[PDB]
Amino acid sequence: NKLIDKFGCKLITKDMIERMERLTGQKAHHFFRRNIFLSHRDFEKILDVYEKGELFYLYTGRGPSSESLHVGHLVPFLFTKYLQDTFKVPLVIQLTDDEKFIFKSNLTLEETHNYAYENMKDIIACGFDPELTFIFTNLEYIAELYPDILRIEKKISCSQIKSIFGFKDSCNVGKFAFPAVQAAPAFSSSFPHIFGGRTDIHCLVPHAIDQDPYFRMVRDVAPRLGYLKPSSIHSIFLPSNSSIFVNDNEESIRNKIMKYAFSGGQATEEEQGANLDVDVSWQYLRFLMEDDEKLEEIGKKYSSGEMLSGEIKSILVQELVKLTKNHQKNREAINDDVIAKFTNKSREQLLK
């Protein structure tokens, strides 16, 4: 909220929420109710465009630093699926095997590439439509992005990078060269095989609020390239070696909440209450629980001291395993042939 000012994003008022629901014909995701996606840039443009019968596209991404996604990383992906189902628009997903090899001394491109492909399985396991979704790694799609990477780079000073991402002269040049790579897919030109070279297809970018810098930068260069400014919709972080992965079994999950999940309850049972703003388990349930009436009542009871830290952690565990089990079976149905449909660069479509 102090970060929303210094970035210069606007809050998503109810009037926007009511408009999307109004235009879509579907109930708003709970990530809106609960201010999980709380922030945007020019999201009102997207609804303007969709109001006019015009199509647009979604862009989101993932950095493969681990073989499996955290559950926290499903927050933007699950939300994007909802947006794809609601607007029925194409989606574009970048796996940044280049970035994480660059920004993490303890990594190689062989590992990042493999982690990328496993990560795709977790991503597809969220139930995206392959007829509407194009997924790709930077190592494999770099040539298609290169022309827009070069155009963005020519318009930004090295000093502007420092100013935006806070790098220093001591940083490796790879760090300076990546932002353009992440910026590039927010322009329709970077996907000739779906949009046909058109430059007039608006892009909407769901992302954790910490990714905002890349898209602040690209919104500044857009006009100088005669391109549309991409719109953004921001989520808050999902708070914290080992945190909860989507391929964790029931025992792993229970083990981690009980030992590593910071409680807001009193040390002993001096609960005739608890602090919900610091309780990690409460904040997790806010993302997961589709039942509103349960949530308020859990929050009330755990606040007032008629629920111990022990019980709130158990409720979360069973929610996490329901989530993680449903994702794990969906993942079993994902083979190289299913991947191929998502990775297939060509889409015989009529946007031209």
Ligand X SMILES: N[C@@H](Cc1c[nH]c2ccccc12)C(=O)O
User: Which residues of the chain form contacts with ligand X (CB under 6 A)?
Assistant: 59-63, 94, 96, 99, 182, 205, 207, 211
Of the candidate spans 40-48, 88-96, 138-146, 182-190, the one that interacts with a copy of itself by CB under 8 A turns out to be: 138-146
Could you tell me which of 42, 17, 8 has the C-alpha nearest to residue 232?
Answer: 42
Angle, helices 292-304/280-288, rounded to nearest 10 degrees: 170
What phi, psi does 253 have (nearest 5°)? -60, -55
- Residues numbered 162 to 191 that lie near a copy of itself (CB under 8 A) are 162, 167-177, 179-180
Least Å distance, CB 182 to a copy of itself, is 13
Q: How far apart are CA 137 and CA 145, in angstroms?
A: 11
3-state secondary structure of 11: strand
Angle at alpha carbon of residue 172, lines to 171 and 174, rounded to 5°: 130
Question: Do residues 83 and 133 lie in contact, with contact meaning Cβ atoms separated by under 8 Å?
Answer: no
The residue (of 177 and 258) whose beta carbon lies closer to a copy of itself is: 177
Least Å distance, CB 329 to ligand X, is 25
Of the candidate spans 47-55, 72-80, 82-90, 136-144, the one that interacts with a copy of itself by CB under 8 A turns out to be: 136-144
**Residue position matching structure tokens 């760090």:** 175
Could you tell me which of 65, 64, 57, 72 has the C-alpha nearest to residue 120?
Answer: 64
Q: Which does 79 bind (CB under 5 to 8 A by kind): ligand X, a copy of itself, none?
A: none
Question: Do residues 58 and 230 lie in contact, with contact meaning Cβ atoms separated by under 8 Å?
Answer: no
Q: Check binding of 151 to a copy of itself (CB under 8 A).
A: yes
Q: Which does 150 bind (CB under 5 to 8 A by kind): ligand X, a copy of itself, none?
A: a copy of itself
Q: Which does 62 bind (CB under 5 to 8 A by kind): ligand X, a copy of itself, none?
A: ligand X
Least Å distance, CB 108 to a copy of itself, is 9
Least Å distance, CB 257 to a copy of itself, is 36
C-alpha radius of gyration, the chain, whole number: 21
Q: Check binding of 150 to a copy of itself (CB under 8 A).
A: yes
Q: Which does 4 bind (CB under 5 to 8 A by kind): ligand X, a copy of itself, none?
A: none
With 0-12 CB in 10 A as exposed, 13-18 as middle and 19+ as buried, what is 143? exposed
How many angstroms separate the Cα of 120 from the Cα of each of 68, 124, 243, 288, 334? 9, 6, 20, 22, 9
The residue (of 79 and 136) whose beta carbon lies closer to a copy of itself is: 136
Q: Which does 23 bind (CB under 5 to 8 A by kind): a copy of itself, ligand X, none?
A: none
Q: How far apart are CA 125 and CA 329, in angstroms?
A: 8
The residue (of 117 and 176) whose beta carbon lies closer to a copy of itself is: 176
Of the candidate spans 58-66, 117-125, 154-162, 294-302, the one that interacts with a copy of itself by CB under 8 A turns out to be: 154-162
Least Å distance, CB 193 to a copy of itself, is 15
Least Å distance, CB 9 to a copy of itself, is 25
